[PDB]
Design a protein around this ligand. Structure first.
Ligand SMILES: *[C@@H]1O[C@H](CO)[C@@H](O[C@@H]2O[C@H](CO)[C@@H](O)[C@H](O)[C@H]2NC(C)=O)[C@H](O)[C@H]1NC(C)=O
Ligand SMILES: *[C@@H]1O[C@H](CO)[C@@H](O[C@@H]2O[C@H](CO)[C@@H](O)[C@H](O)[C@H]2NC(C)=O)[C@H](O)[C@H]1NC(C)=O
Ligand SMILES: *[C@@H]1O[C@H](CO)[C@@H](O[C@@H]2O[C@H](CO)[C@@H](O)[C@H](O)[C@H]2NC(C)=O)[C@H](O)[C@H]1NC(C)=O
Ligand SMILES: *[C@@H]1O[C@H](CO)[C@@H](O)[C@H](O)[C@H]1NC(C)=O
Ligand SMILES: *[C@@H]1O[C@H](CO)[C@@H](O)[C@H](O)[C@H]1NC(C)=O
Ligand SMILES: *[C@@H]1O[C@H](CO)[C@@H](O)[C@H](O)[C@H]1NC(C)=O
Lengths: 170, 49, 49, 118, 287
C-alpha cells in the first residue's frame, strides 16, 4: 500500500464477517481471530541468537489490513488515483462483472452470497484448529530451522578424532 | 545414500570413528530423503490437476 | 583398519572419513541447488498446464 | 564466573520459579545447556540468566550532512555499553527518543526507526 | 546357623512380559515438556523377564551383566535383602544389603559365605549368610527399603560404583509386574571397584521374585512440568516404536516413515588361488 489505509469506521461489508479477518481492537495484541488461531499454533549464551523484526506482528497486520480492506470495498482505487466511493454491493457487482458473471447474481442472491463466504470462513477457522497440521506450511519451516540451529549446537559435542570435543578443556 | 555404508560399513571401528562427526552425515541422509519426497511433490503439482 | 596399528589407523581413518564426508556433502549441496532449479521448473510447468 | 560442585559456566543468579525433584541437581534447556542449578550447600534452586551480551552496530546518517551517530547494543541494559534510549531493539547511546511517530529512515528494530532533524 | 536347603525347585523361569515397566531415571537433570532420547541400561519393553518363586525356599543365582532389575511380593514376614558379587565363592569384596527393624545396612567385605545363605530370624542375623568375613571396605546405613505394594529396585555398576535405586507400586497380579510407569531413584552410591557378575536374593528365615537384565537400549522418555518422567518408548522394540524414536514423538501421525535398514552380512568365506604344478623346491636342500 502506498500508505496504510484505514479500515472504514463503518464495517459495511454486506453482512460479511470481516471482523474475523481484520485485527480485533479490544485485545492487547492487535490480531484477528484467524490470526490468533495460527499464532497460538506456529512457534543463547552459546553464541547463537535471534534478532527482532523491524515490522512487528501488529505492524504487518496494519499493512495487511490496509491492503485487505481496500481489496474488499474499493480494490486498487486507494492506490492508482484518489479513493473511489464504491459501496460494497457495487464493488461486488463489479467484482462479478469482471469475471464474466452477470451482476444480477449479486442482487438476486445478495443473502446467499453473504452466507457462503461467511460459512466458508467459519469452516476455515474450524479446519485450521481441528487439524493443526493445516498450519504446517509455517510450523514445519520454523521447526526445521530451529532443528538446524539446535543441531548446530549439538554438534559442539563432536570431537572429530580429538581427545576431547571441548576447546577450553584441551 | 546410506552414509554408514558409503563411508565404511560392516566395521565396528569405522562406525565408532564415523560417529565422532556426530550428525554431520545424518543430515545428508536426511537431505537426500527430503529431495526424493520433493520430487514426488513436483510430479503431483505438475500432473494431478 | 586391517593394516595399521590401531592409533595410527585412527589417524589415517579420520583423514579419509573426512574426505569421503566432504564428497557426500558436496554432492548433496549440488543436488539441493539443482533441486531448487528443478522445483522451479516443475512449478512453471504446472503453471503452464 | 560459576563453579557449582564442578559444574562451570557464566551468568547471573536469580531465585528459580521451579523446583527440582529431590534427586535432581541440575537443570537443562532444549539445547542441553545449563538452565539452572541446585545450590550444593543450602538446598534451593537458582536459575542462571546469561550475562548481558549481544552484537553492536552503529546508526549513522550520511557523512555528507552529519557525523552524529549512535551505538546500538542488542537485548541489554544501556549501562553495559546523557542521550540514552533504552529498548530491546538495542540501546542507543548518543541519541534521543520521541513519542511521535515518523516515516522510517534508518530502521532499528521492534517498531522503532531513527531519523534526523535540524 | 547355616542350615542348607539347596531346594533346587528347578521351576521354569516363567519369563513374562515386562510391558512398559523397567524404566527408571539414571540422570540428575531437570527437564520438562520434552522428550529425551537416552542410550542406557533399561529393561526392554514387552520383553520376557523371569518371575521365579522361592516358594523349600530356593536361592538361584542370576547374571548381573551390566545391570539388573529386581522386584518382589512378600506376606507377613517380609524379606528385604540381597547377596551380590563377582563370584560369591568367599574370595572378593561382595556386597550385602540387609534391612532390619530401623534401617538398611549396606555392607561390603570379603564374606566367607555359606553354601545356601539366609538371614536368621528380634533381629536379622548375617551370620547365617556367611560364617565369617574380613578385609572390609564399606559400610553405610540408609533409609529402609520397606514401603499390595511391590518393591522395585534397579541395580547398576557405574565405573566401580554400585548404585542402588528404589520405588514401590500396587499389585493387581501376584506373579506379574503391574502396568504403569516406573521411576526408581538412588538411595546409595558405593565406591567398591568390584566386577559384580552374580546376583543372589537374600532370604530371611520364616516369596515371589521378578528378575530381569537390563539392556543397552535407547529409550525416548517423556518429561513433565515437575522434572519427572511420566512415560517412555523403547526405541525400535517393534515397528511403531521404531517410528516413534525416529520421529522423537510418542504419537505418530497416519503415514509412512523411513525408520530402519535391512542389512545382510556374509556368513561364508571363500578363498581360491591357481592350481599349483610348481610347488617350490625347498626339498632340494631340505631333504
Ligand atoms: C461473526 O462471527 C462471530 C463469532 O466470533 C459472531 O459472534 C457471535 O454472535 C452470536 C450471535 O450473533 C453470539 O451468540 C456469539 O456469542 C458470538 N460469538 C462470539 C465469540 O462472540 C458474529 O455474530 C458474526 N458476525 C456476523 C455478522 O455474522
Ligand atoms: C550447609 O550450609 C548451609 C548454610 O547456609 C545450611 O543451609 C541452611 O543453614 C541455615 C543456618 O545454618 C539454616 O537455617 C537453614 O535451614 C539451612 N537450609 C537448608 C536447606 O538446610 C545447611 O544446613 C548446611 N548443611 C547441609 C547438610 O546442607
Ligand atoms: C507438580 O507439583 C506441583 C506442586 O507445585 C503440582 O501443582 C499443584 O497442583 C495442586 C492440585 O491442584 C494444587 O493444589 C496446587 O496449587 C498446585 N501447585 C502449584 C500450582 O504451585 C502439580 O500437580 C504437579 N504437576 C505434575 C505435572 O506432576
Ligand atoms: C559528499 O562527500 C563526498 C566526499 O566526502 C564528496 O565527494 C561529495 O561531493 C559530497 N556530496 C555532497 C552532496 O556534498
Ligand atoms: C512524551 O511523553 C512525555 C511523558 O508523558 C510527555 O511529557 C511529552 O510531552 C511527550 N513528548 C512528545 C514529543 O509528545
Ligand atoms: C622332506 O621329507 C619329509 C619326510 O617325508 C617331509 O615331511 C617333507 O614334506 C619334505 N620337505 C620338503 C621341503 O619337501
Amino acid at each position: 500500500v502506498k500508505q496504510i489505509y484505514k479500515t472504514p469506521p463503518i464495517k459495511d461489508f454486506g453482512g460479511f464477517n470481516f471482523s474475523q479477518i481484520l485485527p480485533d481492537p479490544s485485545k492487547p495484541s492487535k490480531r484477528s481471530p484467524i490470526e490468533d488461531l495460527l499464532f497460538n499454533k506456529v512457534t543463547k549464551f552459546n553464541g547463537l541468537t535471534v534478532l527482532p523484526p523491524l515490522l512487528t506482528d501488529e505492524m504487518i497486520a496494519q499493512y495487511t489490513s490496509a491492503l485487505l480492506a481496500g481489496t474488499i470495498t474499493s480494490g486498487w482505487t486507494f492506490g492508482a488515483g484518489p479513493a473511489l466511493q464504491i459501496p460494497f454491493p457495487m464493488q461486488m457487482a463489479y467484482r462479478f462483472n469482471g469475471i464474466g458473471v452477470t451482476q444480477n447474481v449479486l442482487y438476486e442472491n445478495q443473502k446467499l452470497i453473504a452466507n457462503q463466504f461467511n460459512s466458508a470462513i467459519g469452516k476455515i477457522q474450524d479446519s485450521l484448529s481441528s487439524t493443526p497440521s493445516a498450519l504446517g506450511k509455517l510450523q514445519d519451516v520454523v521447526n526445521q530451522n530451529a532443528q538446524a540451529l539446535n543441531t548446530l549446537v549439538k554438534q559442539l559435542s563432536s570431537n572429530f578424532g580429538a581427545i576431547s570435543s571441548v576447546l577450553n578443556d584441551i | 545414500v546410506d552414509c554408514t555404508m558409503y563411508i565404511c560399513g560392516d566395521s565396528t571401528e569405522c562406525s565408532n570413528l564415523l560417529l565422532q562427526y556426530g550428525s554431520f552425515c545424518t543430515q545428508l541422509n536426511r537431505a537426500l530423503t527430503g529431495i526424493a519426497v520433493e520430487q514426488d511433490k513436483n510430479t503431483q503439482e505438475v500432473f494431478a490437476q | 583398519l586391517s593394516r595399521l596399528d590401531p592409533p595410527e589407523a585412527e589417524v589415517q581413518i579420520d583423514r579419509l572419513i573426512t574426505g569421503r564426508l566432504q564428497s557426500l556433502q558436496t554432492y548433496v549441496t549440488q543436488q539441493l541447488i539443482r533441486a531448487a532449479e528443478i522445483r522451479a521448473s516443475a512449478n512453471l510447468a504446472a503453471t503452464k498446464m | 564466573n560459576f563453579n557449582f560442585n564442578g559444574l562451570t559456566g557464566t551468568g547471573v543468579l536469580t531465585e528459580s520459579n521451579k523446583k527440582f525433584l529431590p534427586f535432581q541437581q541440575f537443570g537443562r534447556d532444549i539445547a542441553d545447556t545449563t538452565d539452572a542449578v541446585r545450590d550444593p550447600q543450602t538446598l534451593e534452586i537458582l536459575d542462571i540468566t546469561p550475562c548481558s551480551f549481544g552484537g553492536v552496530s552503529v546508526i549513522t546518517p550520511g557523512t555528507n550532512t552529519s557525523n552524529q551517530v549512535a551505538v546500538l547494543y542488542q537485548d541489554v541494559n544501556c549501562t553495559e555499553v546523557s542521550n540514552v534510549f533504552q529498548t530491546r531493539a538495542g540501546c542507543l547511546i548518543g541519541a534521543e527518543h520521541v513519542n511521535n511517530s515518523y516515516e522510517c529512515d534508518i530502521p532499528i528494530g521492534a517498531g522503532i526507526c531513527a531519523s534526523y532533524q535540524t | 546357623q547355616c542350615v542348607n536347603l539347596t531346594t533346587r525347585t528347578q521351576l521354569p523361569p516363567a519369563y513374562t512380559n515386562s510391558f512398559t515397566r523397567g524404566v527408571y531415571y539414571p540422570d540428575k537433570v531437570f527437564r520438562s515438556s520434552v522428550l529425551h532420547s537416552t542410550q542406557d541400561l533399561f529393561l526392554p519393553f514387552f520383553s520376557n523377564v523371569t518371575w521365579f518363586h522361592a516358594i523349600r525356599f530356593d536361592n538361584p543365582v542370576l547374571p548381573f551383566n551390566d545391570g539388573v532389575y529386581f522386584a518382589s511380593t512378600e506376606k507377613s514376614n517380609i524379606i528385604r535383602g540381597w547377596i551380590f558379587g563377582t563370584t560369591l565363592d568367599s574370595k572378593t569384596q561382595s556386597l550385602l544389603i540387609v534391612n532390619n527393624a530401623t534401617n538398611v545396612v549396606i555392607k561390603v567385605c570379603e564374606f566367607q559365605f555359606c553354601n545356601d545363605p539366609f538371614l536368621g530370624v528380634w533381629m536379622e542375623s548375617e551370620f547365617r549368610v556367611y560364617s565369617s568375613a574380613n578385609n572390609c571396605t564399606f559400610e553405610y546405613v540408609s533409609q529402609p527399603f520397606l514401603m499390595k505394594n511391590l518393591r522395585e529396585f534397579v541395580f547398576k555398576n557405574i565405573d566401580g560404583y554400585f548404585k542402588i535405586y528404589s520405588k514401590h507400586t500396587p499389585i493387581n497380579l501376584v506373579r506379574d509386574l503391574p502396568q504403569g510407569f516406573s521411576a526408581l531413584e538412588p538411595l546409595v552410591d558405593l565406591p567398591i571397584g568390584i566386577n559384580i557378575t552374580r546376583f543372589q536374593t537374600l532370604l530371611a528365615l520364616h516369596a515371589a521374585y521378578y528378575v530381569g537384565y537390563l539392556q543397552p537400549r535407547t529409550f525416548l522418555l517423556k518429561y513433565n512440568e515437575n522434572g519427572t518422567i511420566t512415560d517412555a518408548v523403547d526405541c525400535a522394540l517393534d515397528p511403531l516404536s521404531e517410528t516413534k524414536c525416529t520421529l522423537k514423538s510418542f504419537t505418530v501421525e497416519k503415514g509412512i516413515y523411513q525408520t530402519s535398514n535391512f542389512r545382510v552380512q556374509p556368513t561364508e568365506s571363500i578363498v581360491r588361488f591357481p592350481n599349483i604344478t610348481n610347488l617350490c623346491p625347498f626339498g632340494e636342500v631340505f631333504n
